[PDB]
C-alpha cells in the first residue's frame, strides 16, 4: 500500500549540539532538502556527512567533516558543500569564481635554497580517474580498475621517470615499515576519520606504490585518492623538484588519455578529490625545517598566518602552503618559495629585526 508513511527527514537529522565545518553549515532546511537526492552511483548525503557526524572534532581544530563519493556528488550536494568549500578556502566562492590550472616549470624563479634548515623538499598532488567512484564509495571492482589503469599507464613511462610498481599485498611487512620510515610508503589507515569515511575497506587489496629508480618520483595508488603523485628531493633545489613533478605529471596524463581515460576536472573546482580541503589543485609543496633556531621564536604563528603557510609536525617541523583552490600550482609554489626564503632570511638569531611583513 502507498498509504504507509515515511520517516520525516527531521527524524534523521544528526545531533550536532557538541560538534565543530559541516556541523555549523548543516541546517534542518538543507538536510530536509537533500535527504532524498543521490548521485547516479547511489551516493547519498548521510554517507557524505557520516565521517563528520561520527567524529565531533576537538575544539579549536577545524575539519571539513565530509567527503565525496564521485564527481557528481559536488553537483548534486552543491548546496551543502559550497559553503564548506568557501569557508575552507578563505573566501573562494565555487558558484561564481573559476579556477585556472598551470603546470609550467619555466615561470618559477629562485628555486635554489640554502642548506641550513631546508633538509628536504617535496611536492604532492592528487588525481582521480573519471568514470570510477572515489575511494569512499568505490567497490572492489572499481578499485582494481583504477589500479590497472594507473599501472598500465605508468608502464609506458621512459627515461628518468622509469621505475617499478610494488603491490602492498605482495610486499613484506619489514620492507613496508622500512619504506614508511624512509618516507616512501603509506601506512594502513587507523585514525577514526579514514575508517569512518569508509576508505580502509578491503585493505590492502588494490593499493600500491609506483616509484622511479632514483626514488625521486612516487605515486600512491588507492591510499586516499585514485592517485597521489609525489616528487621528492633530499635537498633544497625546489626548482628541479617542481620541474620533474610537472613534466612527469604531463607524461602520466598523456598516457592516461592514450587509453581513453580522463582525470576528473571541471572549471569551477578543478581537479576533483575526496576531501573538499584538497579541491582545486591538491598541491602541497613544502619542506622540512629545524627546531632550534625556530622553535624559541617570538610569534611565528602570526608570521605563518601572514605569509599563508601551514606548519605541522614532521612525519623540527614541516612547512607548506595552506590553500589549494584558487591560486594556481605555479602561484602556490612561488608563494611557498618566497615564504621559506623570508623565514630563512629573518631567522637570524645572531641579531634581531623580524619584520613579519604581511
Ligand X SMILES: *CC(=O)N1C[C@@H](C(N)=O)Oc2ccccc21
* Residue 240, binding choice from ligand ADP, a second copy, ligand X, none, Cβ under 5 to 8 Å by partner class: none
d(CA 329, CA 308): 15
- Residues 277-296 binding ligand ADP (CB under 6 A) are 284, 286-288
* Residue 255, binding choice from ligand X, a second copy, ligand ADP, none, Cβ under 5 to 8 Å by partner class: none
Beta bridge partners of 266: 270
* Out of 24, 25, 33, 38, the residue judged to bind a second copy by CB under 8 A: 38
Instruction: Look up residue 151 and give its three cell numbers.
Output: 599501472
Q: Is 334 helix (H, G, I), strand (E, B) or coil?
A: helix
Instruction: From 8-16, 101-109, 112-120, 244-252, give the range in contact with a second copy by CB under 8 A.
Output: 8-16
- To the nearest whole angstrom, how small is the minimum distance from the Cβ of residue 179 to ligand X? 21
DSSP string, 208-245: EEEEETTSSEEEEESSSSSEEEEEEESSS-HHHHHHHH
**By the rule CB under 8 A, 178 interacts with a second copy:** no
Q: Which residues of 131-154 are buried (b: 16+ CB within 10 A; e: fewer)?
A: ebbbbbbbeeebbebbbebbeebb
* Out of 315, 351, 357, 358, the residue judged to bind ligand ADP by CB under 6 A: 315
- For residue 16, give the nearest of 64, 57, 61 by alpha carbon: 57
Residue 336 to residues 49, 308, 319: CA-CA distances in angstroms? 32, 8, 9
d(CA 248, CA 260): 19
Instruction: Look up residue 248 and give its three cell numbers.
Output: 612527469
Give the x/- contact pattern for ligand X in 55-74, rule: CB under 6 A: --------xxxxx-------
* Out of 111, 131, 156, 235, the residue judged to bind a second copy by CB under 8 A: 131
- For residue 199, give the nearest of 228, 229, 164 by alpha carbon: 228
**By the rule CB under 6 A, 168 interacts with ligand X:** no
Q: Is 313 annotated as a binding residue?
A: yes
Size of the site for a second copy (CB under 8 A): 59
Strands (E), 86-180: 121-127, 163-167
- Residues 189-248 binding a second copy (CB under 8 A) are 192, 195-196, 198, 200-203, 205
Q: Is 1 annotated as a binding residue?
A: no
Residue 197 to residues 30, 138, 275: CA-CA distances in angstroms? 21, 12, 10
DSSP string, 60-99: T--------SSHHHHHHTHHHHHHHHHHHTTT--TTT---
* Residue 287, binding choice from ligand X, ligand ADP, a second copy, none, Cβ under 5 to 8 Å by partner class: ligand ADP
**By the rule CB under 8 A, 109 interacts with a second copy:** no
**By the rule CB under 6 A, 320 interacts with ligand X:** no
* Residue 193, binding choice from a second copy, ligand X, ligand ADP, none, Cβ under 5 to 8 Å by partner class: ligand X
* Out of 124, 207, 239, 268, the residue judged to bind ligand ADP by CB under 6 A: 124
Contacts for 310 with CB less than 8 Å, ≥ 6 apart:
286, 304, 319, 320, 321, 322
* Residue 141, binding choice from ligand ADP, ligand X, a second copy, none, Cβ under 5 to 8 Å by partner class: a second copy
**Contact set with ligand X (CB under 6 A):** 51-52, 63-67, 193-194, 197, 199, 224, 274-275, 277
**Contact set with a second copy (CB under 8 A):** 1-15, 17, 28-29, 31-32, 35-38, 41-42, 44, 46, 50, 53-54, 129-133, 139-142, 144-145, 148, 169, 192, 195-196, 198, 200-203, 205, 257-262
**Contact set with ligand ADP (CB under 6 A):** 120-122, 124, 183, 284, 286-288, 315, 318
Binding-site entries: 120-124, 183, 228, 284, 312-315, 318
Amino acid at each position: 500500500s502507498e498509504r504507509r508513511r515515511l520517516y520525516p527527514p527531521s527524524a534523521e537529522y544528526p545531533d550536532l549540539r557538541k560538534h565543530n565545518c559541516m556541523a555549523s553549515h548543516l541546517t534542518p532546511a538543507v538536510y530536509a532538502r537533500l535527504c532524498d537526492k543521490t548521485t547516479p552511483t547511489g551516493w547519498t548525503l548521510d554517507q557524505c556527512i557520516q565521517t563528520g557526524v561520527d567524529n565531533p572534532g576537538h575544539p579549536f581544530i577545524k575539519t571539513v567533516g565530509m567527503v565525496a563519493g564521485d564527481e557528481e556528488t559536488y553537483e548534486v550536494f552543491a548546496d551543502l558543500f559550497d559553503p564548506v568549500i568557501q569557508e575552507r578556502h578563505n573566501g573562494y566562492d565555487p558558484r561564481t569564481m573559476k579556477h585556472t590550472t598551470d603546470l609550467d616549470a619555466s615561470k618559477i624563479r629562485s628555486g635554489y635554497f640554502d642548506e641550513r634548515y631546508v633538509l628536504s623538499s617535496r611536492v604532492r598532488t592528487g588525481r582521480s580517474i573519471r568514470g570510477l567512484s572515489l575511494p569512499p564509495a568505490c567497490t572492489r571492482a572499481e578499485r582494481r580498475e583504477v589500479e590497472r589503469v594507473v599501472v598500465d599507464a605508468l608502464s609506458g613511462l621512459k627515461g628518468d621517470l622509469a621505475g617499478r610498481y610494488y603491490r602492498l599485498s605482495e610486499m613484506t611487512e619489514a620492507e613496508q615499515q622500512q619504506l614508511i620510515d624512509d618516507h616512501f610508503l603509506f601506512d594502513k589507515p587507523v585514525s577514526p576519520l579514514l575508517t569512518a569515511a569508509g576508505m580502509a575497506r578491503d585493505w590492502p587489496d588494490a593499493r600500491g606504490i609506483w616509484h622511479n629508480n632514483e626514488k625521486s618520483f612516487l605515486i600512491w595508488v588507492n591510499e586516499e585518492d585514485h592517485t597521489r603523485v609525489i616528487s621528492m628531493e633530499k635537498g633544497g633545489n625546489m626548482k628541479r623538484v617542481f620541474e620533474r613533478f610537472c613534466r612527469g605529471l604531463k607524461e602520466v596524463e598523456r598516457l592516461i588519455q592514450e587509453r581513453g581515460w580522463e582525470f576528473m576536472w571541471n572549471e569551477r573546482l578543478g581537479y576533483i578529490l575526496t576531501c573538499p580541503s584538497n579541491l582545486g589543485t591538491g598541491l602541497r609543496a613544502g619542506v622540512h625545517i629545524k627546531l632550534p633556531l625556530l622553535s624559541k621564536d617570538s610569534r611565528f604563528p602570526k608570521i605563518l598566518e601572514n605569509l599563508r603557510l601551514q606548519k605541522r609536525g614532521t612525519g623540527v617541523f614541516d612547512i607548506s602552503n595552506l590553500d589549494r583552490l584558487g591560486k594556481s600550482e605555479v602561484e602556490l609554489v612561488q608563494l611557498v618559495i618566497d615564504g621559506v626564503n623570508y623565514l630563512i632570511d629573518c631567522e637570524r638569531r645572531l641579531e634581531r629585526g623580524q619584520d613579519i611583513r604581511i
